[PDB]
Amino acid sequence: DEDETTALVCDNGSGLVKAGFAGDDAPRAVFPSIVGRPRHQGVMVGMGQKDSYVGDEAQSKRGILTLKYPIEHGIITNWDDMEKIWHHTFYNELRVAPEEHPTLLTEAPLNPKANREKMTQIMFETFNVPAMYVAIQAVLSLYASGRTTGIVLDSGDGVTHNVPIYEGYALPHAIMRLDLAGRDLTDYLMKILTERGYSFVTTAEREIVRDIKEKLCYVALDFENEMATAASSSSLEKSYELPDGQVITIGNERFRCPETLFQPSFIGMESAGIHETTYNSIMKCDIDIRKDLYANNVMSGGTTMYPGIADRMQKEITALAPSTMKIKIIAPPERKYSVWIGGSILASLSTFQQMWITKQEYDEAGPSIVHRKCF
């Protein structure tokens, strides 16, 4: 730094802009991926001294704002804020120039192809960065576990992926991405608060909804059996005092939202459970490889941190998995910051310098340079 290239590590995901420096094991800046916009209206004389709201600063105020989500479904809908997000990352959190170091940002797999170019364009040309790489999300989570073969089950905010990866980067398989992760479960809960009685309509309390979900809603081994227990619950029934005033009694609700993740039928969707994809991708592969795919079940992303998520994959997996192989869940103590931890690993590499896309490359090999390095 100031004479060494030394990159950053940015996991500009759809849930947290997990930024931090190269070779670190903690992301310095962690702040949401919601950009805020007013709705309070009125006159002014004094003001909040802002009018453009970004990350944690956006989050701060919710009572005066409607919280827009720049990245939905791994597609960045609004690019105008993205320079300013990254200006909030480099200048205003990490306290660095875009010029001093590259920037490793994340690509959510099977991304819309125009975004890959569009992003770089904002960086190099408009925000002068010496280099950058838009890595493949899921792959970074493999390296985080220290695994080098397995089935990476990354359920981050916006997208879930069942990615079988081999020692050397895999050839197209049933490597897949699906929207069914954390945001979606946030949107399901609100459905179910509609038939409850408690009111939660807008963006501003939707984030509060996402909070009520994360820290309580344990993953039932089977919904139906804990459903019957709901009748004379004692440990299923507790009140989650809303931390700004209200009691939010949650009975059946607690293991109703987590079960939805693996059974999209509770929404009224036809999508496959994430444990179905697990079977599909592993069975497809040669008989002698299934043993190691089922041995190494990597489960990263914050969504796979609900209480009792671990014991859920012990029956779900054994269902449509044979008796000819060991079945063992890999779930590292922390796993929310999983794509960011992996990029840090790459940045400790000097080959990643030459596996990243240079400033000069953009002008020298046209815009298609992007897809030339990310394949």
Ligand X SMILES: Nc1ncnc2c1ncn2[C@@H]1O[C@H](COP(=O)(O)OP(=O)(O)O)[C@@H](O)[C@H]1O
Binding site for ligand X (CB under 6 A): 11, 13-16, 155-160, 181-183, 186, 210, 213-214, 301-303, 305-306, 336, 339
What minimum distance in Å lies between the beta carbon of 103 and a copy of itself? 17
Closest contact distance (angstroms) between CB of 364 and ligand X is 32
Identify which of residues 92 and 203 has a Cβ nearer to a copy of itself in the complex: 203
Identify the three-state secondary structure at position 301.
coil
**CB 156, CB 14: distance < 8 Å:** yes
Which residues, other chains included, contact 165 with Cβ-Cβ below 8 Å and sequence gap of 6+?
138, 139, 142, 149, 150, 152, 175
Q: Choose between 46 and 333: whose C-beta lies nearer to a copy of itself.
A: 46
**Burial, 199: exposed, middle or buried (Cβ in 10 Å; 0-12, 13-18, 19+)?**
exposed
Contact partner, 208, from a copy of itself, ligand X, none, Cβ < 5-8 Å per class: a copy of itself
Instruction: Compute the least distance from the CB of residue 369 to a copy of itself, in Å.
Output: 15
Helix (H, G, I), strand (E, B) or coil at 309: coil
Q: Which does 228 bind (CB under 5 to 8 A by kind): ligand X, a copy of itself, none?
A: none
Please identify, using beta-carbon distances, which residue of 344 and 358 lies nearer to ligand X: 344
Q: Measured from the CB of residue 336, what is the shortest distance to ligand X in angstroms?
A: 5
List the single partner that 62 binds among a copy of itself, ligand X, none, CB under 5 to 8 Å by kind. Answer: a copy of itself
Instruction: Using DSSP, state whether 285 is helix, strand or coil.
Output: coil
Q: What does 314-360 look like in DSSP terms, one character per residue?
A: HHHHHHTS-SSS---EE--S--TTHHHHHHHHHTT-SSTTTSSEEHH
Residue 155 or 296 with smaller CB distance to ligand X: 155
Considering CB distances under 5 to 8 angstroms, the limit depending on partner class, which of a copy of itself, ligand X, none binds residue 302? ligand X
Q: Which is nearer to ligand X, 282 or 305 (CB)?
A: 305
Cα separation of 102 and 135, whole Å?
13
